[PDB]
Amino acid sequence: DALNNVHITDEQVLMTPEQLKAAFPLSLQQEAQIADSRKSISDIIAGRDPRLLVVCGPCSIHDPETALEYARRFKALAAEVSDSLYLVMRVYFEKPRTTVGWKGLINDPHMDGSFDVEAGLQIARKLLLELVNMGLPLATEALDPNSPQYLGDLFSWSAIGARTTESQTHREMASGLSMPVGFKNGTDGSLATAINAMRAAAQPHRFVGINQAGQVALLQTQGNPDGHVILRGGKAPNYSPADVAQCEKEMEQAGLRPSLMVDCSHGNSNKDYRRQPAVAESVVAQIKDGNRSIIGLMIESNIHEGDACISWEMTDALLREIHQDLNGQLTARV
Amino acid sequence: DALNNVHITDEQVLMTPEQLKAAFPLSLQQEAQIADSRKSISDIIAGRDPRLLVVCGPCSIHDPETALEYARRFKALAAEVSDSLYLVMRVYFEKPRTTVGWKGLINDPHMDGSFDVEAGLQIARKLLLELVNMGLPLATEALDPNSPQYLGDLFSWSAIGARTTESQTHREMASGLSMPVGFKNGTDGSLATAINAMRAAAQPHRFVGINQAGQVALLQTQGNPDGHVILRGGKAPNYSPADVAQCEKEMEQAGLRPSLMVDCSHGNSNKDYRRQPAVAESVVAQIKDGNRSIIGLMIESNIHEGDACISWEMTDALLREIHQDLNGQLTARV
Ligand SMILES: N[C@@H](Cc1ccc(O)cc1)C(=O)O
Ligand SMILES: N[C@@H](Cc1ccc(O)cc1)C(=O)O
């Protein structure tokens, strides 16, 4: 053709969500465990559970074995602290916002720039199934309408940022996701985008995505009742008590019940791993001081540091310190 | 299902690109016309055609009749300046840059929050076909891997921004597009993203999109040889002679022959319509003083003024004045 596919040499129909799930299905036990973790995170966000939601893990998943080692250490740490903190392992296969670099375990699993999406999807789903069998709740970030259909049944929490809310085809996708959702503030620091997205997510909507057969589809949503804001900083950090108070005020003026998670990383640490514990400790001080809107923390943490990810030893010490400082000023708030 | 589509109430398969094009096919005259306008734009970008490429039109399309009214004036003006300026009408249905508001003619053609994408696609393609039959080359912006399959056969030029380059599944989509492509600089003013994307677009690549049957597919690309940079400001405008010289320097240092278009709007006018003409005039001055890299202009222009769109009268006066000023210096470059 003179106009169509002039610069396309080949086209290959991808494996569908149907086929991926049939090749790597969930067991009844795994399904029940995931539903229960989603319910627990919903209860925490809604204030019915006193514990603090801690989404912690690597900046981006590198390979299955390292992720499993981190998961072993993380589950070990979580069993000791779960009476005050609900640890959820973030499994991000890719990093937002790059013109450059490795495309991640799903797109380039062989790590040679070959773009083998189909093998990456199977590797990722197998790894996620293994993580679920370890008893770990998993956290993701929604960046497109396709990956929820392939892998969303394995996650208990999702972050929503500008890649969703600034599209028009699927800006309302959060209202149709089966998991609790946290809405990141604007890159400039605007809370309005996150607040509007959180309010809209509780309502029925329609968006363009795919069906289980990999076909472009129009989806009608029911509304997602489990939403909260994520404070991740803008040009300047926004975790301070004054910024938290401003967030609570803007949420209350929107008619929402103030519920927010503090990202200790990117915009509140300014890309430096050394600042994350300071943000976490400021949040702990605020919770001690009768703050009730802060429902969770986000922490970027690898086995080693240096990346804005803190080392595993720092993560262990920090989570233990938070648990010791958060004695029962969290049962105080139910 | 207790895990899948909990908050989804309905799902229907959207009309495929195949079916859309079967319902609203291109006549062979329009096909040859679009191919010829693509070739002419490619010639301008490569420096074979001395004329200046001018992409100009509404901030976004409001409804079909307003678009047609604009189009008749724009075609009339294009006829009278066609020896020096090659006019291309920008037809942007979606806006980038929002989380609230009207979803545009494609998603909400009834403009009542209905999200009737299937009717919007047909209305949009009907409008585009009528615009093509008026003899107007058309310009779009690629914000999505699916909309090119539905409507790209009607466009002669496409802008490429962060929505493409800062995804990791279709970051190379431009290398597989059948039309010349302009790469916008980063929001911060960084030229590296646009330059790297422009270089990568000339190479064979792979990206995830859809086939003509609406199925998720992996596309292998041949490479797109018709690329240029779009200067659209950052934290400050970047159209000045010093900024253009720096862009030339960075492009040459990347191995690219300097070829750029100056956006007289968003970052370069500070979203103040009153400043758009000055920008354009500056570009004119630079060409009169020996510039060889500036190949085009982009102008946001509607029937009425202030949106940072300029009025049609401002547009007409500005384009005529540019045409008067440019006559001889353009053939002297090639
Ligand atoms: N299946 C997803 C919802 C969804 C459906 C279609 C999509 O394209 C994206 C997401 C869930 O249960 O959360
Ligand atoms: N059909 C487009 C190329 C394309 C193919 C698949 C996509 O998902 C997107 C774009 C063109 O000819 O320009």
Nearest chain A CA: its distance from B165 CA (Å): 6
Nearest chain A CA: its distance from B68 CA (Å): 24
CA quadruple A36, A41, A46, A52: dihedral, nearest 10 = 130
Tell me the Ramachandran region of residue A270: left when phi exceeds 0, alpha when psi lies from -120 to 50, beta otherwise. left
Structural domain harbouring B55: 1-334
Measured at the CA of B253, the angle between CA B248 and CA B254, to 5 degrees, comes to 100
Residue A49 and residue A43 in contact, taking contact as beta carbons nearer than 8 Å:
yes
The SS3 assignment for A20 reads: helix
User: From the CB of residue A242, how many other CB atoms can be counted at a distance below 10 Å?
Assistant: 8
Bridge partners (DSSP) of residue A182 are A159, A228
- Cα(B212) to ligand 2 centroid in Å equals 9
Residue showing tokens 């422009």: B198
Nearest chain B CA: its distance from A296 CA (Å): 23
Domains in chain B, number: 1
Distance of CA B109 to the CA centre of its chain: 21
* H/E stretch holding A117: helix A117-133
Radius of gyration (C-alpha) of chain A in whole angstroms: 20
Asked if A234 reaches chain B (Cβ–Cβ under 8 Å), the answer is no
The angle, 0 to 180 degrees and rounded to 10, between the axes of the packed helices A241-253 and A191-201 is: 40
Euclidean distance between CA atoms B58 and B127, whole angstroms:
15
Residue A161: burial class (beta carbons within 10 Å; 0-12, 13-18, 19+): buried
Start-to-end C-alpha separation, chain A? 65
Closest CA to B267 of B172, B185, B177, B183: B185
Q: Give the sign of the dihedral formed by CA B52, CA B53, CA B58, CA B59.
A: negative
Q: Is A2 in the pocket of ligand 2 (CB under 6 A)?
A: no
Closest CA to B24 of B163, B138, B131, B116: B131
Q: Is the CB of A11 less than 8 angstroms away from the CB of B219?
A: yes
Q: Is the CB of A153 less than 8 angstroms away from the CB of B117?
A: no
Q: Resolution in angstroms for this experimental structure?
A: 2.0
Which mutation among A1, A7, A8, A12 tests ligand 2's pocket best, with the greatest number of atoms within 8 A of CB?
Answer: A8
Euclidean distance between CA atoms B246 and B191, whole angstroms:
9
Euclidean distance between CA atoms A148 and B14, whole angstroms:
18
Asked if A218 reaches chain B (Cβ–Cβ under 8 Å), the answer is yes
Q: In the numeric block, which tokens belong to residue B275?
A: 């400043």
Query: Which CATH number goes with the domain that contains B121?
Result: 3.20.20.70
Nearest to B214 among A9, A215, A222 (CB): A215
Residue B293 and residue B244 in contact, taking contact as beta carbons nearer than 8 Å:
yes
Q: Is A152 in the pocket of ligand 1 (CB under 6 A)?
A: yes
Q: Where are the beta strands (DSSP E) in A23-98?
A: 52-57, 85-90
Distance of CA B23 to the CA centre of its chain: 25
Who contacts B96 (Cβ-Cβ below 8 Å, separation ≥6)? A166, B141, B143, B161, B163
* H/E stretch holding B261: strand B260-263
Who contacts A24 (Cβ-Cβ below 8 Å, separation ≥6)? A122, A125, A126, A129
Euclidean distance between CA atoms A69 and A316, whole angstroms:
14
- Cα(B176) to ligand 2 centroid in Å equals 6
Closest CA to A312 of A41, A71, A44: A71
Backbone angles phi, psi at B315, to 5 degrees: -60, -50
Q: In the numeric block, which tokens belong to residue B121?
A: 């696609």
Who contacts A110 (Cβ-Cβ below 8 Å, separation ≥6)? A116, A119
Euclidean distance between CA atoms B140 and A221, whole angstroms:
30
Closest CA to A37 of A178, A171, A159: A178
Asked if B188 reaches chain A (Cβ–Cβ under 8 Å), the answer is no
Asked if B31 reaches chain A (Cβ–Cβ under 8 Å), the answer is yes
Bridge partners (DSSP) of residue A261 are A230, A296
Q: Is A178 in the pocket of ligand 1 (CB under 6 A)?
A: yes
Query: If contacts are CB pairs under 8 Å, which of residues 88-127 in chain B contact chain A?
Result: 94-100, 103-104, 106-107, 115, 117-118
- Which atom of ligand 1 lies nearest, measured to the CA of B4? 12
Euclidean distance between CA atoms B171 and A98, whole angstroms:
10
Breaks in chain B after (C-N > 2.5 angstroms)? 306
Residue B314 and residue B304 in contact, taking contact as beta carbons nearer than 8 Å:
no
Bridge partners (DSSP) of residue A21 are none
Euclidean distance between CA atoms A268 and A274, whole angstroms:
11
Residue B283 and residue B297 in contact, taking contact as beta carbons nearer than 8 Å:
yes
Q: How many residues does chain B have?
A: 334
Bridge partners (DSSP) of residue A181 are A158, A227
Q: How do the residues of chain A divide into helix, strand and coil, expressed in percent and rounded to 5?
A: 45, 20, 40
Task: Among B1, B5, B153, pick the best mutation site for testing chain A contact (most A Cβ within 10 A).
Answer: B5
Q: In sequence order, which ranges of A227-298 are alpha helices (DSSP H)?
A: 241-253, 266-269, 276-288
Nearest chain A CA: its distance from B64 CA (Å): 19
- Find the closest chain A residue to B185 by CA distance: A99
Euclidean distance between CA atoms B121 and B109, whole angstroms:
9
The SS3 assignment for B59 reads: coil
Distance of CA B308 to the CA centre of its chain: 17
* H/E stretch holding B147: helix B147-151
Q: In the numeric block, which tokens belong to residue A157?
A: 């929490």
Q: Is B180 in the pocket of ligand 2 (CB under 6 A)?
A: no
Radius of gyration (C-alpha) of chain B in whole angstroms: 20
Residue B21 and residue A194 in contact, taking contact as beta carbons nearer than 8 Å:
no
CA quadruple B254, B259, B263, B264: dihedral, nearest 10 = 120
Q: How many residues does chain A have?
A: 334
Closest CA to B85 of B333, B330, B302: B330
- List Cα–Cα distances, B252 to A99, B229, B248, B286, in angstroms: 19, 12, 6, 19
Q: Give contacts of A104 with chain B, Cβ < 8 Å.
A: 168
Strands B294-300 and B52-57, by their bridges, are parallel
How many residue contacts between A and B have a Cβ separation below 8 Å? 183
CA quadruple B217, B218, B221, B224: dihedral, nearest 10 = 60
Q: In what order do the strands lie in the sheet with B216-221?
A: A8-13, B216-221, B206-210
